[PDB]
């Protein structure tokens, strides 16, 4: 396909997924709310091939990955399991939220710490 889409005017299109990056630092909750306000969600990582552009992202950003008490496992905002061998998760700060970083890394942060964040609309 020559055309990438449907996406908002002024969003980044890649393989028919739509992304936008936000420099105003917010906690995970305010971040998730902001993404949803623009008909999006926080970055979900489902594919190394389809989201290979994420290798070239500088610095760390809120993605939509949350830890549940009496769960031990990580899962997305939408209730999806995290797929195996997609992300390496690293303890940085005690918390139940995860920052995305290159290359397919999740750094654990307190959900209350303001951070830059990435929205993605699922095209499903």
């Amino acid at each position: 396909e020559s055309y990438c889409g449907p996406c908002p005017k002024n969003w980044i299109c890649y393989k028919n997924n739509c992304y936008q990056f936000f420099d105003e630092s917010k906690n995970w909750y305010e971040s998730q709310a902001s993404c949803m306000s623009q008909n999006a969600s926080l970055l979900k990582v489902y594919s190394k091939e389809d989201q290979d552009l994420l290798k070239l992202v500088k610095s760390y950003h809120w993605m939509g990955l949350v830890h549940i008490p009496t769960n031990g496992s990580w899962q997305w905002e939408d209730g999806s399991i995290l797929s195996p061998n997609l992300l390496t998760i690293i303890e940085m700060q005690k918390g139940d939220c995860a920052l995305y970083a290159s290359s397919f890394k999740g750094y654990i942060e307190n959900c209350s710490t303001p951070n830059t964040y990435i929205c993605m609309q699922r095209t499903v």
Partner: protein, 264 residues
């Protein structure tokens, strides 16, 4: 003239295994404090501290991630520091290094002129060193280019600062005052004071008939900060009464030779 210097001193912290949100960057220009930056902003000692703020906040984040690849001690406070300094010399030649400190002790050094990494010998310095070099290998794009760009960043920033004419290395020549005291046993002490001078380097000694007295036949003030950005020192010697005219205080500072006799 000593070279023009620029330093960046970055500190991240860990409590009981957990890397804290805070980090602090001290920027020093020609050895003088110039900026303090936290996660949110830099501050001087206008709001065109944006550049420094966008930049030094990135390094803090990188060093938060670097510390996360060091979980050898899940107990207590721990510090990690990234210190980059570059210098411009009088010959127009340049120096540039980067040092990593953990709990205030050095474990990795990089001379950016000669592209040469150096470890200390302790088993502790090496495990930290390698931990970090491994994190860098781990596809974390720590290409040769990264370090050559850091080199040229520090030097370009130095030039930009120098050019805005912010901290001058202006000479302030000493006020000199010779004095007499302890008039006893037909013996006098003569004291030559130099005060209010910059820079710090000064020569000051008593001469008998134009010849410098030995270091040992002479008492020596330290070089004390005046508490206004300048320095003071003194030197003194014991002489027989009536030999005053044979004794002079000689001083060199910033290409200025001056001789001061004992006032009668």
């Amino acid at each position: 003239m000593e070279p023009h210097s620029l330093r960046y001193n970055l500190t991240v912290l860990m409590w009981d295994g957990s890397v804290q949100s805070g980090f602090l960057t001290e920027v020093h220009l020609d050895g003088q404090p110039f900026l303090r930056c936290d996660r949110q902003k830099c501050r001087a000692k206008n709001k065109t501290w944006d550049r420094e703020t966008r930049d030094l906040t990135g390094n803090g984040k990188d060093l938060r991630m670097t510390l996360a690849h060091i979980k050898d001690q899940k107990e207590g406070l721990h510090s990690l520091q990234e210190i980059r300094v570059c210098e411009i010399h009088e010959d127009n030649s340049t120096r540039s290094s980067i040092h990593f400190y953990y709990d205030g002790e050095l474990f990795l050094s990089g001379n950016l002129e000669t592209k040469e990494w150096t470890m200390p010998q302790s088993s502790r310095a090496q495990t930290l060193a390698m931990n970090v070099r491994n994190f860098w290998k781990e596809d974390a794009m720590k290409t040769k280019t990264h370090w050559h760009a850091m080199h040229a960043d520090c030097l370009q920033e130095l030039r930009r600062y120098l050019k805005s004419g912010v901290v001058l290395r202006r000479t302030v020549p000493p006020m000199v005052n010779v004095t007499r005291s302890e008039a006893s046993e037909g013996n006098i002490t003569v004291t030559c004071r130099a005060s209010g001078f910059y820079p710090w380097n000064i020569t000051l000694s008593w001469r008998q008939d134009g010849v410098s007295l030995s270091h040992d036949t002479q008492q020596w003030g330290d070089v004390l900060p005046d508490g206004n950005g300048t320095y003071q020192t003194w030197v003194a010697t014991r002489i027989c009464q009536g030999e005053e005219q044979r004794f002079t205080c000689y001083m060199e500072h910033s290409g200025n030779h001056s001789t001061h006799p004992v006032p009668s």
